[model samples]
Target: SHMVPDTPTRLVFSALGPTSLRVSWQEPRCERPLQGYSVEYQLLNGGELHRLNIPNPAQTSVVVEDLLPNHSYVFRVRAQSQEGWGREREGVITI
Candidate 1:
């Protein structure tokens, strides 16, 4: 059956520096081939929204730059299939 894939699992974050971070995640088990992945992130104190679209399903990690130090950031990772985007796996980090 064709449908939205399950939520991605094992979302993790690694600090590359005070201004950058590496985000990694696992794909959901899907019957259909994934189209891509959407990574959305933002700072909790400010309202600026940042988004990263990864077209390669094989790519699991991305570096997010231009971040502030010692601030809590929220990240959401989701997989996209033909049906639609899957449920998001969320993570937070202070760096």
Candidate 2:
């Protein structure tokens, strides 16, 4: 299979409040550029999951809101391009 020369890295995740969180990651460079990014999250125990695509220029960070208070959840993020979606990085947070 063909592959993009660059890979996403330096993923960071943080809880902003009882019901909010933030995520950030880096893409050193892209051969074909990128359209956007996306994040998917769910409780490890299994529950409603959410996915969102970030808009252009590859935002280094994103804020997620409207989450349940005092809960623990696991998340993953990936970069998207006209070529295809990159690998997803995993994280966990307590809110």
Candidate 3:
């Protein structure tokens, strides 16, 4: 009964190594009128942009790799539905 999904929550990260991490979040609590999720990441200093799409709404974790140590990176996630893109949740970390 909703057009747009709520923002993702509890954005957290688990460092897999010096150059990689696994990002995870919780989906909205309301009815899951979503098609998938879009994950995006970028460096704080502006370099290259990376993005991925999770077609399965049941999945809530993704691993990002090939990063430089001690650099700040921003990760964002949002849900997509037939109506449109939902609100976004973002987290930043220095690896």
Candidate 4:
């Protein structure tokens, strides 16, 4: 039998003050230890994209800095487990 994966449950992104933003999400249920979580983002208008990997035991949320005010951004997140990397869950936030 195959082990069930840790699917992303709720994905959320919000502006953190003026020049920052926060992203968070929950997993279905992890029996094994989580390897990490990665967040990828880019400007809606178009620019260089970026990705960040967050280690386990950390909160589901991460604060991203150095953002332009009043700009719209698109972001996606995924969790990694011993089984494998899960699917991508996406959201958008404007600051």
In candidate 2, position 73 carries an lDDT of 80
The superposed Cα distance between candidate 3 and the true structure at residue 90, in angstroms, equals 0.9
lDDT by residue for model 3 (2-29), tens? 5777889968999998999999998764
Instruction: State residue 34's C-alpha deviation in candidate 1, in Å.
Output: 0.4
Worst 10 residues of 2 by lDDT: 1-10
Pairs of residues at least 3 apart in sequence or in different chains that clash in candidate 2: none
**What does candidate 2's lDDT look like per residue over 1-95, in tens digits?**
32442445766878787778788877645667677777888877789989887876457688989988867888787776677777777777777
How do all the candidates rank in terms of TM-score, highest first?
1, 3, 2, 4
Better of 2 and 3 by lDDT: 3
lDDT of 2 at 53: 76
Give the least accurate 10-residue stretch of model 4, judged by summed lDDT: 1-10
Q: Number of clashing residue pairs in every model?
A: 1, 0, 1, 1
Off by over 4 Å in 2: 1-7
Residue 26 of model 2 has an lDDT of 79
lDDT winner:
1
The better candidate by lDDT, 1 or 2, is 1
Local accuracy of candidate 4 as per-residue lDDT tens digits, 1-95: 12334566666767678999788888546666777888889999999898988877356888999888988888888777778776777788887
- Candidate 1 lDDT at 84 equals 89
Could you tell me the C-alpha RMSD of candidate 2 in Å?
A: 2.3
